[PDB]
């Protein structure tokens, strides 16, 4: 462009989207108005639990839970690891992370933080999946 | 110049590459290889063969025939320069002594095997090593010595200085 063009309008960079929009919103009951606050993790209440058929190429059933977070946003969270404790009205803690197999999931459930009891029988990567040392 | 020296070749990329027929694919390998002597000379070559070493040696054989010189002034190139071959856009800036060469593999190889010890660089354009190396040599073709430039103009080195 010409310099006069660049002065009449300077540049404008790209509008960045977050991987994790719902972690980046807080709530106050008083105002009843969402408040932008960068957050790593949120807790919620499992509305629904179920299985998913993932994309091509894959075919295994994937465990998800539809959660209502603390801030009121309804979110689908993958339940990683072998087996789980969860059911309806179960409280859950939620971190970000995208299940590439599965279309509508963008977040994971931290395993071992709350009523998400740790995985059974696991020995390796225990800090993930939330088993104590035996 | 020529195949008349002891040299220090280095292989940059070896790309398996496929011609295709009614009977499917007839894979071959390409080898781009940089030859030099750290007392100052460098050159790149390419070769093709169904085998890794065959391609390597053809590349060496083209390299030893398509070489050039680069000035090594005070462990640095004499001045800043840019090469522009195709999608290759690669600038070379000198740097302070003892800093070391600062570059990616396919350009680092060129400058090291010439023996230039202290240079900065940055790939601006494409990342394809063939065009990167064509860019490097297009650049270090542009480089000039102070004595040569004085001989052109009619000046003295202390007068350019």
């Amino acid at each position: 462009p010409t310099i006069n063009q660049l002065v009449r309008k300077p540049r404008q960079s790209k509008i960045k989207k977050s991987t994790s929009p719902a972690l980046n919103k807080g709530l106050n009951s008083f105002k009843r108005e969402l408040t932008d606050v960068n957050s790593p993790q949120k807790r919620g209440v499992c509305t629904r639990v179920g299985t998913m058929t993932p994309k091509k190429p894959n075919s295994a059933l994937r465990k998800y839970a539809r959660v209502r977070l603390s801030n009121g946003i309804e979110v689908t969270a993958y339940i990683p690891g072998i087996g789980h404790n969860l059911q309806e009205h179960s409280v859950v803690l939620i971190r970000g992370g995208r299940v590439k197999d599965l279309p509508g999931v963008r977040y994971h459930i931290v395993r071992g933080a709350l009523d998400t009891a740790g995985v059974e029988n696991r020995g390796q990567s225990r800090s993930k999946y939330g088993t104590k040392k035996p | 110049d020529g195949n008349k020296l002891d040299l220090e070749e280095r292989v940059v990329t070896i790309n398996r590459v496929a011609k295709v027929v009614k009977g499917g694919r007839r894979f071959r390998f390409t080898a781009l290889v940089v030859v030099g002597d750290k007392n100052g000379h460098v050159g790149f070559g390419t070769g093709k063969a169904q085998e890794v070493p065959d391609a390597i040696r053809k590349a060496v054989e083209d390299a030893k025939k398509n070489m050039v010189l680069v000035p090594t002034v005070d462990t640095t190139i004499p001045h800043t320069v840019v090469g522009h071959f195709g999608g290759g856009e690669i600038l070379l800036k000198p740097a302070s002594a003892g800093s070391g060469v600062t570059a990616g593999g396919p350009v680092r190889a060129v400058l090291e095997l010439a023996g230039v010890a202290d240079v900065s660089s940055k790939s601006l354009g494409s990342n394809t090593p063939i065009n990167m190396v064509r860019a490097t040599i297009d650049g270090i073709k542009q480089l000039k010595n102070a004595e040569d430039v004085a001989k052109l103009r009619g000046k003295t080195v202390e007068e350019l200085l």
Binding site: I3 | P78, T80, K144, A146, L152, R153
Partner: protein, 130 residues
Amino acid sequence: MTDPIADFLTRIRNANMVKHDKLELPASKIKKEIAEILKREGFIRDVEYIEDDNAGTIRVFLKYGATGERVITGLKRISKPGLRVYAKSTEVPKVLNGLGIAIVSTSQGVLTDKEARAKQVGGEVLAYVW
């Protein structure tokens, strides 16, 4: 139009390309200054000025080394109408760490970067020469 000096530098480039021996262009004071300066620096075989009905004309005889080697690799303008460049004695940079040269027009007349350093002046960076 809007640029005599750029026309001058570009005609010199375009004659470097074809390796013409001479190149004639309408003249002005600044053009004559920069021709003088290139003759001082060692880029021009010779320059001579000519009278005409309009404005006077200038002719540059170009300088090549042996084997038809070029002595001018490149010219360039920096301070332009749409954007000018004004630099100090400290902000004029050494073209190619001193292999090439620049032109800075200052209070002490039109000069090079090195002369402008010697006189500790500054002003319009009119041009670089690789």
